[PDB]
Ligand binder design. Structure first.
Ligand SMILES: *[C@@H]1O[C@H](CO)[C@@H](O[C@@H]2O[C@H](CO)[C@@H](O[C@@H]3O[C@H](CO)[C@@H](O)[C@H](O[C@H]4O[C@H](CO)[C@@H](O)[C@H](O)[C@@H]4O)[C@@H]3O)[C@H](O)[C@H]2NC(C)=O)[C@H](O)[C@H]1NC(C)=O
Ligand SMILES: CC[C@@H](C)[C@H](NC(=O)c1ccc(F)cc1)C(=O)N[C@@H](COP(=O)(O)N[C@@H](CCC(=O)O)C(=O)O)C(=O)O
Ligand SMILES: *[C@@H]1O[C@H](CO)[C@@H](O[C@@H]2O[C@H](CO)[C@@H](O)[C@H](O)[C@H]2NC(C)=O)[C@H](O)[C@H]1NC(C)=O
Ligand SMILES: *[C@@H]1O[C@H](CO)[C@@H](O[C@@H]2O[C@H](CO)[C@@H](O)[C@H](O)[C@H]2NC(C)=O)[C@H](O)[C@H]1NC(C)=O
Ligand SMILES: *[C@@H]1O[C@H](CO)[C@@H](O[C@@H]2O[C@H](CO)[C@@H](O)[C@H](O)[C@H]2NC(C)=O)[C@H](O)[C@H]1NC(C)=O
Ligand SMILES: *[C@@H]1O[C@H](CO)[C@@H](O)[C@H](O)[C@H]1NC(C)=O
Ligand SMILES: *[C@@H]1O[C@H](CO)[C@@H](O)[C@H](O)[C@H]1NC(C)=O
Ligand SMILES: *[C@@H]1O[C@H](CO)[C@@H](O)[C@H](O)[C@H]1NC(C)=O
Ligand SMILES: [Ca+2]
Ligand SMILES: [Cl-]
Ligand SMILES: [Zn+2]
Ligand SMILES: [Zn+2]
Length: 691
C-alpha cells in the first residue's frame, strides 16, 4: 500500500545524519562558488531520487561581503589617536577546521562603509521600549553617539533602525552571556555554549518583505531595471558590526554616565552596565572608533526547484521549501532543515518509483540567499506570483529542524491547526519518558496551550524566514515545525557562529537523529496530507476562534483610552460583527463540506478552502509596508521575528498617547478598524454558497 504510513516509514534517521554531514563540511555562503556547487549537487540528487523535473532558478541580487584585504574592526582610541584596543578579526576556528578556507569573518551584512569615532551609549537590547526609557525617562540623547546593544529579544535589523532613528552614528552588536551562555554547560567544543571569541553574523536590513533591495515587486532577472543604491530598499544609514563578549567586556568596562535604570538592563559580564554616554573620569577622553569596509555587490544566487507532478490536480501546488545558504557551516541553520528536506524528497521519490503519484503537485525548494533577506524565495515568488496565487494550496517551511531537544514547536495559520493535531496523534513521541506515547501527548504535556486544556501551544507565524513572501504577501496557507528547548529553564547559543557545525549537532543536540526524524515526519506528513487528501485538510472554524481572540485583544488595547474612544466615537462593533458572521458562515460551510460523488462541488469546495487564506490579503498593503498585505497577521513593526495580529489597528494604537494630533491618530485607528472588519466579512463571504 502507498499511503502516508508507507511514506513515513521510508524516512530514516541515519539518512538525515549522512546528509547533514555532507552539507556541513565547507561553508556555503550565498553567492559563493561552494554554494553554487551544492545547488548543482542537490539538483542532481533530487533527479536521481525520482522527481519529474529539477531546475535551477537564478537571480542577480544585492549581497554584501567584507573586504578580504581591508578587515572590519572596532577600536578604543586615545586622545593622540593611538588605537589601544582592537576587536578580533576572526573567530578562533574550532578543532579540525583551523585550515578550512573561505570562512567569512564576523560582519553585519549590508552595513555601509565608514569610520565613525565617538562616545558610547549602552542601549540594552535596542528595542523600541529601551529607546523610550533612554530618551523619555532618562533624558539620554543618542544623537551623534555610537550605540552598543546586546543581541537578543528582537531581530537585529529592528535594533539598527531604532538606533538610526535615535540619531546614532554607529551600532555595535554583541552577544551577552546572559542571553547566549546557559549556566552549567561548557563552551564549544566541550558543550553547546558560546565562547567569548564567538560572534553572531547576520544581516541588518529592514526590507519589510521587499526581497532584493534593488528590484522590489519584480524578479531580479537578466533584464531587470535596478534602483540606484540611494533608492534601494531597507539599507541601514550607519555602520554596524558584531563582536563577542570578550571584546564587549573591554568596550563596556570603562563606561560612565548614568547607572543602568534597573536589573533588566544588566547582563552577566563583570561590568556595571552604565548607559553612558562615554567612559568614566580617567578615560573620559578616549573614544570608540569603528572601521567598516564591507561592500554591497550584485551577485548571482541559485534556487533549486523540484517538481513531483500531481496525478489528479497537477495545477494545485503544495510547496516544501527551506534555505541552503549559510553564514559558515550551517550545522543547524539551515542544514539540519535541508537534510530533512533531502530525506523527504528521497522518500516521496521511492513511492514514485513504485508507480505512486500524489493527488496534487508537490514543489520542493532549496532557497538561496535567505540569510541576506529572504532573497531567493522572494525573487522566485515575484517571478511566479500569478501561478502561486491562483494555484498555491500551502507552503511548509523547512529551515533548522532543531534548536533544542525538549519538545515540538509549531507556528502556522489556524487553517492548519486540526491537521497538525491529527497528524501528531499518529506519530510516535521521541521523548524520554514517553516511549509508546504519541507526539501529541508529549508535546501537549511539555508545551500546553495557554487557553485550552489537553491541547498544545501553536504560535502565529512571524517572519524572518522563507515563508514570508508566501504567507504575508501572497496569502498562501503556511506552516512550520521544529524541535525546541524548554524556555522556562533557560534561541541557541552558537547561532550564526563558526562553531555551529555538524559536531555540535551530533555530539550535543541529537546524537541518534531521532528529533530530526520526528521533524521529518511532521513536515513530510503535513505535505503528504495537503497534497493527497481528497478534501483539503483545512478547518475554517479554527480561524473563526482565533479571530475572536484577536478581536478581544485589540479591543482591550484600545480600551486603555476610554476618554478618547468617547471623544472620537471609536467603535469595534463592526469588527466583532464581522467575526460573528465569519463564525456563523464557517460553521455552515463546514456542514456542507461534510454533507456534500461530485468532483465539481468538491473542487469548488477545495477552491473555497484554498482561497480562504487568500481572502485576508488587501491589495493596497499595510501602511508604508506594501509587501505586507495580510490584514490578520504581519511581522511586528518592532521585531520582524514576532507575528502581530490585526497589525494595521495595532500599529495605529501603538504609543498613541504620544501623538501630537489625537484627532488624526484616532481617525486612523477607526480607518484600520473599518479595513479589518471589511476584510474579515469579505473573507467570510468567500465561504458562503457561491450562487
Ligand atoms: C454581519 O452580517 C449581517 C447579516 O446577517 C449584516 O447585517 C447587515 O447590516 C447592515 C448594516 O447594519 C444592514 O444595513 C441596513 O440595511 C437597511 C436596508 O436593508 C437600511 O435601511 C439601513 O440603513 C438605515 O439605517 C441606518 C442605521 O440606523 C442609517 O445609517 C441609514 O441612514 C438608514 O436609515 C442599513 O443600511 C443590512 O440590512 C444587514 N443585512 C441583513 C440583515 O441581511 C452585517 O452587516 C454583517 N457585518 C459586517 C461587518 O458586514
Ligand atoms: C536564534 C535561534 C534560531 C532558531 C532563530 N531565532 C529566534 O527564534 C529568535 C527570536 C528572537 C531573537 F532575538 C533571536 C532569535 C530562528 O528560528 N530565527 C528565525 C531566523 O532564522 P534565520 O537566521 O534563518 N533568518 C535570517 C534572515 C531573516 C531576514 O532577513 O528576514 C536571520 O534571522 O538573520 C527563524 O528561524 O525564523
Ligand atoms: C556529498 O555527497 C555527494 C553525493 O554523493 C558527493 O558528490 C559526489 O562525489 C563523488 C566522488 O567525488 C563523485 O563521483 C560524484 O559525481 C558526486 N556526485 C554528485 C555531485 O551528485 C560529495 O563528494 C559529498 N561531499 C562531501 C563533503 O562528503
Ligand atoms: C590596532 O590596529 C591598528 C591597525 O593595524 C594598529 O595601529 C597601527 O600600527 C601600525 C604599526 O605600529 C602603524 O604603522 C599604523 O599607523 C597604525 N594604524 C592606525 C590606523 O593607527 C594598532 O597598533 C593596533 N592596536 C593594538 C593595541 O593592537
Ligand atoms: C481531524 O480528525 C477529526 C477526527 O477524526 C476529524 O473530524 C471528523 O471528520 C469526519 C470526516 O468528515 C467527521 O465525520 C467527524 O464527525 C469528525 N469528527 C469530529 C469533528 O470530532 C477532522 O476532520 C480531522 N481534521 C482534518 C482532517 O483537518
Ligand atoms: C578592498 O580594500 C581596499 C580599500 O580601498 C582596495 O584596495 C580594494 O578596492 C577594496 N575592495 C573593494 C572595495 O571591493
Ligand atoms: C539631541 O542632540 C542634538 C544636539 O547635537 C540636538 O540637535 C537634538 O535636538 C537633541 N534632542 C533632544 C531631545 O535633546
Ligand atoms: C538534551 O537533553 C538533555 C536532557 O534534558 C538536556 O540536559 C540537554 O541540555 C539537551 N541538549 C541541548 C543542546 O539542549
Ligand atoms: Ca525583486
Ligand atoms: Cl522552519
Ligand atoms: Zn535559516
Ligand atoms: Zn540564519
Amino acid at each position: 500500500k502507498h499511503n502516508m504510513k508507507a511514506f513515513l516509514d521510508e524516512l530514516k534517521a541515519e539518512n538525515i545524519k549522512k546528509f547533514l554531514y555532507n552539507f556541513t563540511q565547507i561553508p556555503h555562503l550565498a553567492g559563493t562558488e561552494q554554494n553554487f556547487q551544492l545547488a548543482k549537487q542537490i539538483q542532481s540528487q533530487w533527479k536521481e531520487f525520482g522527481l519529474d523535473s529539477v531546475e535551477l532558478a537564478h537571480y542577480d541580487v544585492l549581497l554584501s561581503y567584507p573586504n578580504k584585504t581591508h578587515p572590519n574592526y572596532i577600536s578604543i582610541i586615545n586622545e593622540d589617536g593611538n588605537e589601544i584596543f582592537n576587536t578580533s578579526l576572526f573567530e578562533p576556528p574550532p578543532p579540525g577546521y583551523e585550515n578550512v578556507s573561505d570562512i567569512v569573518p564576523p560582519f553585519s551584512a549590508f552595513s555601509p562603509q565608514g569610520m565613525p569615532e565617538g562616545d558610547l551609549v549602552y542601549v540594552n537590547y535596542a528595542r523600541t521600549e529601551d529607546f523610550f526609557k533612554l530618551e523619555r525617562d532618562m533624558k539620554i540623547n543618542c544623537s551623534g553617539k555610537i550605540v552598543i546593544a546586546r543581541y537578543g529579544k528582537v531581530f537585529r535589523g529592528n535594533k539598527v533602525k531604532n538606533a538610526q532613528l535615535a540619531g546614532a552614528k554607529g551600532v555595535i552588536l554583541y552577544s551577552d552571556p546572559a542571553d547566549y551562555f546557559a549556566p552549567g554547560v561548557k563552551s564549544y567544543p566541550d558543550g553547546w555554549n558560546l565562547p567569548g571569541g564567538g560572534v553572531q553574523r547576520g544581516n541588518i536590513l529592514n526590507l519589510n518583505g521587499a526581497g532584493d533591495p534593488l528590484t522590489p515587486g519584480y524578479p531580479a532577472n537578466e533584464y531587470a531595471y535596478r534602483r540606484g543604491i540611494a533608492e534601494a530598499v531597507g539599507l541601514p544609514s550607519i555602520p554596524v558590526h558584531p563582536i563577542g563578549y570578550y571584546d564587549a567586556q573591554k568596550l563596556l568596562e570603562k563606561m560612565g554616565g548614568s547607572a543602568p535604570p534597573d536589573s533588566s538592563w544588566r547582563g552577566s559580564l563583570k561590568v556595571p552596565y552604565n548607559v553612558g554616554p562615554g567612559f568614566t573620569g580617567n578615560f573620559s577622553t578616549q573614544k570608540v572608533k569603528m572601521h567598516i569596509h564591507s561592500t554591497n555587490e550584485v551577485t548571482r544566487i541559485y534556487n533549486v526547484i523540484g517538481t513531483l507532478r500531481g496525478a489528479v490536480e497537477p495545477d494545485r501546488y503544495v510547496i516544501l521549501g527551506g534555505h541552503r545558504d549559510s553564514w559558515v557551516f550551517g550545522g543547524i541553520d539551515p542544514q539540519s532543515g535541508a537534510a530533512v528536506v533531502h530525506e523527504i524528497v528521497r522518500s516521496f521519490g521511492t513511492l514514485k518509483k513504485e508507480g505512486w503519484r500524489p493527488r496534487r503537485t508537490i514543489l520542493f525548494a532549496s532557497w538561496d540567499a535567505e540569510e541576506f533577506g529572504l532573497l531567493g524565495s522572494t525573487e522566485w515568488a515575484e517571478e511566479n506570483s500569478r501561478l502561486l496565487q491562483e494555484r498555491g494550496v500551502a507552503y511548509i517551511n523547512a529551515d533548522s529542524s532543531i534548536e533544542g531537544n525538549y519538545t515540538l514547536r509549531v507556528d502556522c495559520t489556524p487553517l492548519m491547526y486540526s491537521l497538525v493535531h491529527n497528524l501528531t496523534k499518529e506519530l510516535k513521541s521521541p521523548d524520554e519518558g514517553f516511549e509508546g506515547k504519541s507526539l501529541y501527548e508529549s508535546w501537549t504535556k511539555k508545551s500546553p496551550s495557554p487557553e485550552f486544556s489537553g491541547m498544545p501551544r501553536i504560535s502565529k507565524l512571524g517572519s524572518g524566514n522563507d515563508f514570508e513572501v508566501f504567507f504575508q504577501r501572497l496569502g498562501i496557507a503556511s506552516g512550520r515545525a521544529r524541535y525546541t528547548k524548554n524556555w522556562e529553564t533557560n534561541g541557541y547559543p552558537l547561532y550564526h557562529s563558526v562553531y555551529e557545525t555538524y559536531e555540535l549537532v551530533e555530539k550535543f543536540y541529537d546524537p541518534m537523529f531521532k528529533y530530526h526524524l520526528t521533524v521529518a515526519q511532521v513536515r513530510g506528513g503535513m505535505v503528504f496530507e495537503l497534497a493527497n487528501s481528497i478534501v483539503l485538510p483545512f478547518d475554517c472554524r479554527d480561524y473563526a476562534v482565533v479571530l475572536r481572540k484577536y478581536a478581544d485583544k485589540i479591543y482591550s488595547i484600545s480600551m486603555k483610552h476610554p476618554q478618547e474612544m468617547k471623544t472620537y466615537s471609536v467603535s469595534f462593533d463592526s469588527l466583532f460583527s464581522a467575526v460573528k458572521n465569519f463564525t456563523e458562515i464557517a460553521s455552515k460551510f463546514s456542514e456542507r463540506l461534510q454533507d456534500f460523488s461530485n468532483p465539481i462541488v468538491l473542487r469548488m469546495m477545495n477552491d473555497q478552502l484554498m482561497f480562504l487564506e487568500r481572502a485576508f490579503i488587501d491589495p493596497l498593503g499595510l501602511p508604508d509596508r506594501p509587501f505586507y498585505r495580510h490584514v490578520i497577521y504581519a511581522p511586528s513593526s518592532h521585531n520582524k521575528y514576532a507575528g502581530e495580529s490585526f497589525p494595521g489597528i495595532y500599529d495605529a494604537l501603538f504609543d498613541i498617547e504620544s501623538k501630537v494630533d489625537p484627532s488624526k491618530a484616532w481617525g486612523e485607528v477607526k480607518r484600520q478598524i473599518y479595513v479589518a472588519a471589511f476584510t474579515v466579512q469579505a473573507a467570510a463571504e468567500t465561504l458562503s454558497e457561491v450562487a
